[PDB]
Design a protein around this ligand. Sequence first.
Ligand code: HEC
Ligand SMILES: [Cl-]
Length: 161
Amino acid sequence: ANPEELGKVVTAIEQLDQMRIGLASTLEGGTSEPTLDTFKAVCAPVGKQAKEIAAANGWQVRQVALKYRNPNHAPRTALDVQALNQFDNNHHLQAFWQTDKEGVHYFRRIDVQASCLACHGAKNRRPAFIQEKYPSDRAYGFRVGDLRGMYAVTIPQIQQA
Ligand code: HEC
Ligand SMILES: [Cl-]
């Protein structure tokens, strides 16, 4: 890893975050009843873009949450749990990077805004397709200001070129 690369990671992640926020922005939170707008793609393109960034840069990039919708986003390592804990214990902590044998790891917290409650709010108010597409879903019951999860990036110690 080099200076430009570290900065590129911060920027890429922040752009991914602003992208999600942008897609969700058209939706209200206080709406109880079902609406067609909830069939809008909001978070799937975030995951797709994450894969694209990972592949284009030779990084690992992944969303991680204790309460996840997609099983690919579960915590996997002691570091995942440690990072989520750091975010949980310091609400002002937005992001951090850590180095170890595996390489350089950047984590950036994801918080819950009102719009998000359209699909991650009340369990009983989740849009139809969610439950059958995600049978083991846990990404509900959030309130505005909750810790949603985090982005996790690794710049591996050993590259390919
Ligand atoms: C319905 C249109 C949703 C809106 C509004 C929000 N989210 Fe979402 N989220 C939704 C789906 C269908 C998924 C799974 C996508 C996939 O990769 O298969 C998600 C997932 C996330 C994740 C990834 C971690 C996980 O639980 O799998 C995060 C971090 C996340 N959602 C956060 C999030 C935020 C902050 C939102 C408000 C800006 C938000 N989501 C809105 C459906 C919908
Ligand atoms: Cl989505």
